[PDB]
Q: What sequence folds into this?
């Protein structure tokens, strides 16, 4: 089991990483804080300020600790709630629907998602942090991932790098339709394999067909979305990012999401988040990520959400 | 008159610079925005979108337009209030008490101060902008300058670079004592020349003598100050900045500042701001700006303000 040893190191390291930070007195984030990486060592034998364990010897790299303290706080994630949910209840794997070799876990209480990430991606997240902070403090209705932490586990010379972020679609509300959307069409049909799951993640072409009348929004609700998507896309292309989806969940009826109306007339509440935003191009043209973005919203704000 | 031609170019350029921005639709600030410098040309002859003038031909460089739009807004400075105060009423010079060759002006309504700045200083302000934004959005009771804009006037091959910021001590409240403070002692006595002015800017040694019992603060008011000074100094040393003063004004009685009590017992309202913060050392030791900072607050929060 390569995994049980990964789950272990994670729950171990975060606890030490975040617990040790909670004793140090809180202070503002400085630009200097974003480039910090602190490492702490974990022998199976045990250490002065380190326990021993079933799993093999590893180091636990935690990225930009202070900034994520701030981001967590700013997202209303109480520290020992973070700690309990993540480090004190069995982590749960996930048959990754990602073509990329990245693999996901969730918290037992299903509030957090952990995803693994390319070394390129993690180093880029590290550079996003200023722009992240800036967008977070200007548009608090933003749709981007909510990054709770960035950590690296290194065992036996190999790097596993992770991003703890927010589950957009929790076990809580049952969910009748899901969509991973992009505004592109090629191979945007759920693999017959995916298609037979319980609630399958339908892609674009699936959507234009099964919901051709769309998802309807009140005049007031529609502007808000249209407004902040425009805002996020301007952020995104700024950083020359691509391949990112609008993840969309719909619950039909018979309380914290977006209220909408069906083609037939059903009152339903929608749930959205922008995901897969760490693939930057900082072989693509100068104007290219701009293209991906305009297309992106010109699709969500004309075909996927209507007034 | 080298000056009338400077006052002119300033009032001219800002008007064009800021007026033209007000027609362009508002949007969030991106990291990209901080490094932008837009230039616009002013012939005495006149141009397609440019008038003619008494003064000589110049270009008007305006630094980081979008960010300062944001900073102005965030400081409650309505655009045409900025414009009127600065560009539509005679600018007023000032016998600079600065040993540095920098020279000041104020607005007729005495809400804004313009100061000229070393090319080094302006280029450093340009780099402060991210850290500035970050501190501004975390500590909105911060004592640092309120930067409204950064502009450059270039005439006859020569650079004049300016920083529009906030008058800490306006014509409005009459003011009985002023202090430029640092926590250093050498030559910190008001020059006999300065000392005979109306209300002279007393320096450190002047203070420890004329007000040896200090300035007293309620338990609640004192913590607030002590708290945010600590916060600003941590910002300041972060950027390896030095030579900055706490400017302090006191009004004794017989409504927007800090309430305090005199040695005798007089109820008085204090007015403070941290100034001269663009001299960075990014010949000084690594630990040096840290030293300047600890000394700085350990003086204001023990000798200048007492609980
Ligand atoms: N924040 C999130 N909340 C809920 N589900 C998510 C989240 N992020 C990813 N998922 C699930 O994973 C799917 C896509 O993941 P993502 O695209 O981020 O990973 P990947 O392996 O990089 O995939 P891709 O191959 O498209 O790049 C989504 O359709 C969604 O079902
Ligand atoms: N924001 C402000 N509000 C009010 N007065 C100011 C402000 N900035 C500067 N002054 C006046 O100018 C004096 C010092 O200016 P400052 O130190 O910034 O300029 P300088 O020419 O760089 O001086 P120095 O030689 O000390 O570096 C202050 O004591 C104050 O009287
Ligand atoms: Ca994707
Ligand atoms: Ca990906
Ligand atoms: Ca000074
Ligand atoms: Ca100076």
A:
């Amino acid at each position: 089991t390569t995994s049980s040893a990964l789950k272990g190191a994670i729950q171990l390291g975060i606890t030490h990483s975040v617990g040790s930070l909670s004793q140090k007195p809180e202070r503002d984030v400085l630009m200097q804080d974003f480039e910090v990486v602190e490492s702490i060592f974990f022998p199976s034998q045990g250490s002065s300020s380190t326990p021993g364990h079933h799993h093999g010897d590893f180091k636990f790299k935690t990225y930009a600790p202070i900034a994520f303290r701030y981001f967590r706080e700013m997202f209303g994630i109480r520290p020992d709630d973070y700690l309990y949910s993540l480090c004190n209840e069995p982590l749960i794997e996930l048959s990754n629907p990602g073509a990329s070799g990245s693999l996901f876990y969730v918290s037992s209480d299903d509030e957090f998602i952990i995803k693994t990430v390319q070394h390129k991606e993690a180093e880029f997240l590290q550079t996003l942090l200023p722009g992240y902070f800036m967008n977070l403090n200007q548009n608090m209705r933003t749709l981007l991932p909510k990054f709770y932490g960035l950590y690296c586990v290194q065992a036996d010379g190999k790097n596993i790098r992770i991003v703890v972020m927010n589950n957009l679609l929790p076990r809580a509300v049952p969910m009748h339709l899901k969509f991973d959307l992009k505004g592109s069409t090629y191979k945007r049909r759920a693999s017959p394999k995916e298609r037979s799951k319980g609630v399958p993640t339908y892609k674009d072409l699936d959507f234009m067909q099964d919901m051709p009348e769309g998802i309807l929004l009140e005049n007031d609700h529609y502007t808000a979305l249209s407004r902040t998507m425009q805002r996020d896309c301007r952020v995104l292309q700024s950083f020359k990012i691509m391949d990112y989806s609008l993840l969309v969940g719909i619950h039909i009826l018979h309380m914290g999401g977006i209220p909408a109306f069906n083609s037939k007339g059903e009152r339903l509440l929608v749930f959205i988040g922008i995901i897969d935003i760490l693939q930057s191009y900082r072989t693509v043209s100068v104007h290219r990520p701009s293209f991906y973005a305009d297309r992106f919203q010109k699709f969500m704000c004309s075909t996927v959400f209507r007034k």
